[PDB]
């Protein structure tokens, strides 16, 4: 029934550099089912909505990972699923999957982003003045390069999810 959601959560729990699961696939299923497969509002903001449950995981190398969902106007029948991994002074953005319930390589422009990028705030490259650099160089600065391909709505959702994680981690 919830194939799309579970598929998205599994996807964002793969390492974007190695392609390998950070958490065993069956363990992911068990955690999602035990936590609850429903989608509920966690917090509404002026610019969008953060959706839960907050799913928690521990990666095979012992890092705490968080999966949540989000919405921004510009979506809809759309939800953005994302995985953040806890770091020393914040979080890193591991992966993202946009689910369009009304209806990929483009989506890889959005992750991973290191903690200093998320602290900067994510923004599409147009907003940063079309700076030079590969998508990969720009991601390190929190800049999502899409000008050569609604990405702003995706970025907004991601930024809200980060805000929420920061709020609840304090």
Automatic annotation (TrEMBL):
Topological type in the membrane: Single-pass membrane protein
Domain FMN-binding: 74-165
EC identifiers of the protein: 7.-.-.-
Cofactor(s) required, per the database record: FMN
GO terms, molecular function: electron transfer activity; FMN binding; oxidoreductase activity, acting on NAD(P)H
One GO term (biological process): electron transport chain
Keyword Electron transport set for record: yes
Domain of life of the native organism: Bacteria
Chief localisation class: membrane
GO cellular component: oxidoreductase complex; plasma membrane
Purpose of the protein: Part of a membrane-bound complex that couples electron transfer with translocation of ions across the membrane.
Quaternary assembly: The complex is composed of six subunits: RnfA, RnfB, RnfC, RnfD, RnfE and RnfG.
Family: Belongs to the RnfG family.
Protein name per its UniProtKB record: Ion-translocating oxidoreductase complex subunit G
Organism this protein belongs to: Thermotoga maritima (strain ATCC 43589 / DSM 3109 / JCM 10099 / NBRC 100826 / MSB8)
Organism lineage string: Bacteria, Thermotogati, Thermotogota, Thermotogae, Thermotogales
Residues of the full protein shown: 37 to 224 of 224
